[PDB]
Design an enzyme around this catalytic site. Structure first.
Site, PDB file in Angstrom:
ATOM      1  CG  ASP A 256      14.885   1.845  -4.405  1.00  0.00           C
ATOM      2  OD1 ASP A 256      14.531   2.863  -4.889  1.00  0.00           O
ATOM      3  OD2 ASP A 256      15.031   0.937  -5.093  1.00  0.00           O
TER       4      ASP A 256
ATOM      5  CB  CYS B  68      17.585   5.358 -10.809  1.00  0.00           C
ATOM      6  SG  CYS B  68      17.744   4.411 -12.179  1.00  0.00           S
TER       7      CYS B  68
ATOM      8  CG  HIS C 178      14.089   3.814  -8.212  1.00  0.00           C
ATOM      9  ND1 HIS C 178      14.967   2.997  -7.757  1.00  0.00           N
ATOM     10  CD2 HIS C 178      14.337   3.977  -9.451  1.00  0.00           C
ATOM     11  CE1 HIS C 178      15.657   2.599  -8.720  1.00  0.00           C
ATOM     12  NE2 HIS C 178      15.529   3.153  -9.739  1.00  0.00           N
TER      13      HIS C 178
END
Length: 339
Positions: free
Chosen positions: A244, A65, A246
């Protein structure tokens, strides 16, 4: 985790929306805001890419990440380098060939300059095993070494340690030739690792942090927070706006020809936001200076920050430094009682 996050539209207030050095009104420029966010190259976890080093992972879910946030900040620099800050992505339009080349540089294959393969492998030289946690500084150091191979973009990457940007060092890095009365200046990616608090950001830094998103040169901030890294692209009110990584998407089948199906590299959900107060204090802030003139303008903007209630600067600009024994490794804080 993105899959089950809560998403709010949550305008509609008078507070300026700032994305990477540009100011918008939520009332009148909503579409322009959403276009600007969706135009940014978004990089998420990927699965079923070729095994890293032949034997390692075929997916980065659960470990990649910060590497993905590093890809996003560097991609934005390449977008500015090749396409420009005014560039926007639209469905049903033909994008410049340089756009697919930038995107090509981040696809999940060992022959891409900034693939997850190349980042993870280069990270080993940084003391980090494939699967280990990268802070902003390690990812920044890796991107510097990776960019050496990229003769197309021919970028200079400077990682300013010790909370100090040394202007002579920048000129030393970027000047390709003695300046006249492409090109004479290697477009600069400046990354400044910072630690803004003990477990939380000190609120004296908050106004300085906001102004970092307000410069024409702003690349945003990467930050996290083991396994919860974000690429902050701006702010509205007391909230940062971020991309983001994820969610796990199928790897895109590498490029026969110029065209790449690119829908999955563009975030089309409502932009994520979080309180500046929720921000982990370990970050790296980025700036892109394409020409020496941009760099000089950026320097002027930093000097003007050394005033007002706060700033409160998080780094200093100096012409030269007595460099005969120093560091990295050094970041500085900057703790009150009883921090």
């Amino acid at each position: 985790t993105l899959r089950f996050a809560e998403f709010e539209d949550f305008p509609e207030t008078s507070e300026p929306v700032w994305i990477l050095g540009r100011k918008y009104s939520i009332f009148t420029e909503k579409d322009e805001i959403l276009s600007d966010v969706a135009s940014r190259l978004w990089f998420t976890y990927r699965k079923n890419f070729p095994a890293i080093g032949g034997t390692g992972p075929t997916s980065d879910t659960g470990w990649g990440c910060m590497l993905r946030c590093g890809q996003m900040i560097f991609a934005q620099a390449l977008v500015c380098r090749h396409l420009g800050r005014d560039w926007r992505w639209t469905q049903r339009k033909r994008q410049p060939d340089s756009y697919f080349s930038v995107l090509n540089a981040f696809i999940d294959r060992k022959d891409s300059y900034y693939s997850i393969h190349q980042i993870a492998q280069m990270g080993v030289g940084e003391g980090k095993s494939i699967g280990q946690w990268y802070g902003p500084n390690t990812v920044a150091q890796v991107l510097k070494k990776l960019a050496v191979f990229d003769t197309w973009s021919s970028l200079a990457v400077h990682i300013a340690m010790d909370n100090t940007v040394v202007m002579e060092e920048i000129r030393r890095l970027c000047r390709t030739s003695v300046p006249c009365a492409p090109s004479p200046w290697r477009p600069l990616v400046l990354l400044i690792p910072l630690r803004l608090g003990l477990t939380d950001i000190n609120e004296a830094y908050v106004e300085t942090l906001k102004h970092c998103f307000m410069m024409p040169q702003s690349l945003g901030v990467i930050g996290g927070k083991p396994n919860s890294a974000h690429y902050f692209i701006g702010y509205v009110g007391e909230e940062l706006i971020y991309l983001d990584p994820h969610t796990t998407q199928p790897a895109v089948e590498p490029t026969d020809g110029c065209f790449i199906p690119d829908e999955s590299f563009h975030c089309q959900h409502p932009p994520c936001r979080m309180s500046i107060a929720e921000l982990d204090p370990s970050i790296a802030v980025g700036f892109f200076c394409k020409t020496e003139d941009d760099f000089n303008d950026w320097c002027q903007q930093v000097k003007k920050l050394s005033l007002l209630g706060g700033a409160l600067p998080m780094f200093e600009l100096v012409e030269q430094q007595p460099s005969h024994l120093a560091c990295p490794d050094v970041l500085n804080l900057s703790l009150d009682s009883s921090d």
